[PDB]
Design a protein around this ligand. Structure first.
Ligand code: ADP
Lengths: 88, 217
């Protein structure tokens, strides 16, 4: 029931890649674990301001605290898999 | 080439009118030379004298230190934040560091700055410091490209910008220096280049008292 926020810039290629990759992971190797909320910083920059986001894409585990962050298009799958295990 | 007055004592005189409007000026200098003071005073003077809102983008200092440090100069930045005329945009590093898992850029940062400019109707921006951004990321290539993209966007929005430096390429560059002379401090400012326009050449002395006070020109 923990919450992930993915901060993307629209349909730019790093963000398209990151979202495809992450949906694949969360439907397979992490099937039950996280809730995913996607935040488009091109549409809602004010939310990037609130959450203090600089890099795009940014994956953040936001609930339960503490908040922990990974940046990048997640094309390094094993680093992402390892990172999500540790936040779970 | 139109210029925006700084009202920093002496500066509009040695720069012949102030800073080139709608462009980035680089303020370069080692630690302790007054770069942050120049950046803050540009926005403060902007708001209090011309009613031009400012955005201070900080990549290193906490906004709480920027506020508390401006006090000794008689500048109440919290009042101008409460009034909606100044916004400090906190892009300082997160204490847990940056964990990389693929390619990225700094789109969110550039969209935040753009949003802030529109929300606050800002026409002056200070960024402090370009150097700190590079230190934040083991990806100099990403940062260098994003600073250009940012400068490009700021200029298309029409704002006038100071970027401080201790990388970036500019045709507007101001150098701050602080030399130890025996046991006294000799501070100088030099306008190195100003975008195909006219300015006084060489180092001029300044002092810090209620701002930067340039003299002997
Ligand atoms: N109370 C004060 N009186 C006189 N000068 C001050 C005072 N507080 C700060 N300053 C000057 O403002 C300078 C800002 O310098 P600089 O290092 O170039 O920017 P930054 O703070 O971003 O590193 C300080 O280094 C200091 O010399």
């Amino acid at each position: 029931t923990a919450v992930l926020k993915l901060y993307v810039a629209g349909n730019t290629p790093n963000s398209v890649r990151a979202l495809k990759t992450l949906n694949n992971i969360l439907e397979k190797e992490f099937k039950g674990v996280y809730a995913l909320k996607v935040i488009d910083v091109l549409k809602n920059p004010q939310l990037a301001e609130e959450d203090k986001i600089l890099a795009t894409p940014t994956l953040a585990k936001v609930l339960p605290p503490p908040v922990r962050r990974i940046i990048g298009d997640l094309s390094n799958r094993e680093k992402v898999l390892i990172a999500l295990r540790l936040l779970a | 080439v139109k210029k925006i007055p700084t009202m920093i004592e002496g500066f509009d005189d040695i720069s012949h009118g102030g800073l080139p409007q709608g462009a980035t000026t680089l303020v370069s200098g080692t630690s302790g030379t007054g770069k942050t003071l120049f950046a803050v005073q540009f926005l403060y003077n902007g708001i209090t004298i011309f009613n031009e809102p400012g955005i201070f983008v900080t990549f290193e200092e906490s906004p709480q230190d920027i506020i508390k440090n401006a006090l000794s100069f008689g500048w109440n930045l919290q009042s101008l934040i409460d009034q909606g005329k100044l916004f400090i945009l906190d892009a300082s590093p997160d204490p847990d560091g940056q964990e990389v898992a693929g390619d990225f850029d700094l789109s969110a940062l550039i969209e935040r700055i753009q949003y802030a400019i529109r929300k606050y109707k800002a026409t002056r921006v200070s960024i402090d410091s370009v150097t700190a951004v590079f230190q934040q990321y083991d990806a100099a290539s990403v940062v260098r490209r994003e600073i250009f993209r940012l400068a490009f966007r700021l200029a298309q929005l029409g704002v006038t910008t100071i970027m401080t430096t201790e990388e970036f390429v500019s045709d507007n560059v101001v150098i701050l220096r602080n030399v130890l002379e025996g046991e006294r401090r000799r501070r100088t400012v030099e306008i190195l280049k100003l975008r195909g326009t006219t300015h006084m050449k060489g180092e001029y002395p300044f002092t810090i008292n209620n701002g930067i006070n340039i003299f002997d020109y």
